[model samples]
Target chain A: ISASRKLQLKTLMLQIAKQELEREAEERRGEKGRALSTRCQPLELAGLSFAELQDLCRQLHARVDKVDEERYDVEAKVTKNITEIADLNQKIFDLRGKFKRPTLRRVRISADAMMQALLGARAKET
Target chain B: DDIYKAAVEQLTEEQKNEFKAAFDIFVLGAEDGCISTKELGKVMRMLGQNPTPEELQEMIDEVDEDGSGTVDFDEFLVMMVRCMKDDSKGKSEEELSDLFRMFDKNADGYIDLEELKIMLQATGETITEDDIEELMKDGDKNNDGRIDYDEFLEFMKGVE
Candidate 1:
């Protein structure tokens, strides 16, 4: 599929997942029976006509956009935390392709290097 | 076509404006996310008791012109016009007035918390004072603690 199509599918799947989760959460809250004082109150839209539904969608879209913008800002700031783990994975893959058991000692190594060397040796013999 | 054109021409400017405004609100509400199709249907079924699934399906199918399973603005206006027509045919003016009066319990030409509470009680729903207060907070556009006809219309329009 095209990149845009793939993104559309991903977004649709995410929306469906989020909607189901929200429904379950609402059910759970209702089941609790006791009303809790919270800023995040449940909004009900029962018995609204089509015209009403449209106006609501616009309002909700605006609200979602605002919340998502804040979330994206936070995610952007915290994204650096995963850099080392990604680099480590790339290094492991590179070592796997370039060397057999012989490639293990060609670079600075850790306990993982010993483990890879042992595993590579086992694979070569088998 | 000429007769329809003549009829349109016969409408007062105020009538035309109100129709256009109502249509716009209907379209907006139809597209809004606050109400889902299922919820909309549920509300319709509540109001249109004894209406068959086939009848409901017909309404939906008509509105979903492109078979997109979603009603757009024009489709929404058509549906609202149909609904209003149905209501007019099914109810007498007196009955309509009575229903409006019930909705507008305060006798002050508007609906208030006390009215809603009474209706809720009649329906066996024990809404708390806080719940009524919150509903009013969200719905009372004029901040008058009462919803007049226009406010009620706007509230309903905003529901979806």
Candidate 2:
């Protein structure tokens, strides 16, 4: 992970951790009160028999599955980003290695003279 | 501002309905799964405001499973279907690609750490050293310090 990404993740983890702590604190406080009072009462089946309850359960299950399907989509995007970042990091590293350090010139020549100087040097070497 | 206006104008009634439905589904599912309403509300608030790239990335990390840098199709689909059902309508896999592209400011198919930091800062979140290290570790699959789209998507999908 890059430095910036790491910072972001740390921030996120802090937020999550803070949220969790706050939630726990709230629950602890709420525990002293009537917790059941906040809960929804069991739905009245209204003349529905055991068979109906079974059917209802099945329907609820399907709905949950649909929700899960959607969750999966979001998850996919998140994962893809993760992988992309990793690949990019590798590329950056590889490119960094291939990069030639800027060299200092021992001598300076004008535009017209530079090419002749290179040719003269090559000719001398030859 | 014009783009925002256009986006609002472009929303069809059906799409609006889908968005509402998706939110409802997410709320209902979360409740059923024993997720606190407060937690859900926090997520909603975060979503309501456009997050900075860093914040968005962190959000992705929080929910990501495999610690990859990007979210995959399944994960993206699940979040969209559950959280903003209407926004996801008519969004094909190809179109979904656009969503990730929006954040890849460098057009490198992945968000960099600096980008992520700015994003998180925009969302009123503070980054920590551990967070940075973890994200880098997760994003850098090969022990390097960058991320790509595939790695990002895989990471997002793995999150519970």
Q: For residues A1-126, write the lDDT of model 1, one tens digit per residue.
A: 222232233234334334545666688888665554354567777988999899989988998899899989888767865776578657856965456453122322221232245334421100
lDDT tens digits by residue: candidate 1, B20-86: 5533554533544433456555544443233344544544565465744455544444443433222
- By summed lDDT, the worst window of 10 consecutive residues in model 2 chain B runs over B82-91
Candidate 2: stretches off by over 4 Å:
A1-126, B1-96, B125-128, B158-160
Please report, in order, the local distance difference test score of every candidate based on alpha carbons.
0.47, 0.48
Q: Give the range where candidate 2 chain A is weakest over 10 consecutive residues by summed lDDT.
A: A106-115
The alpha-carbon RMSD values of the candidates against the true structure, listed in the order shown, are: 33.8, 31.0
Q: Candidate 2 on B2-51: residue-level lDDT in tens? A: 12212333456764565456456666334433333344435444433322
* Candidate 2: tens digits of C-alpha lDDT, residues A27-106: 87888565655553356768888999899899879977987998999999999999997897789668754675643333
The C-alpha stretches of model 1 lying farther than 4 A from their native spots are A1-126, B1-97, B125-134, B157-160
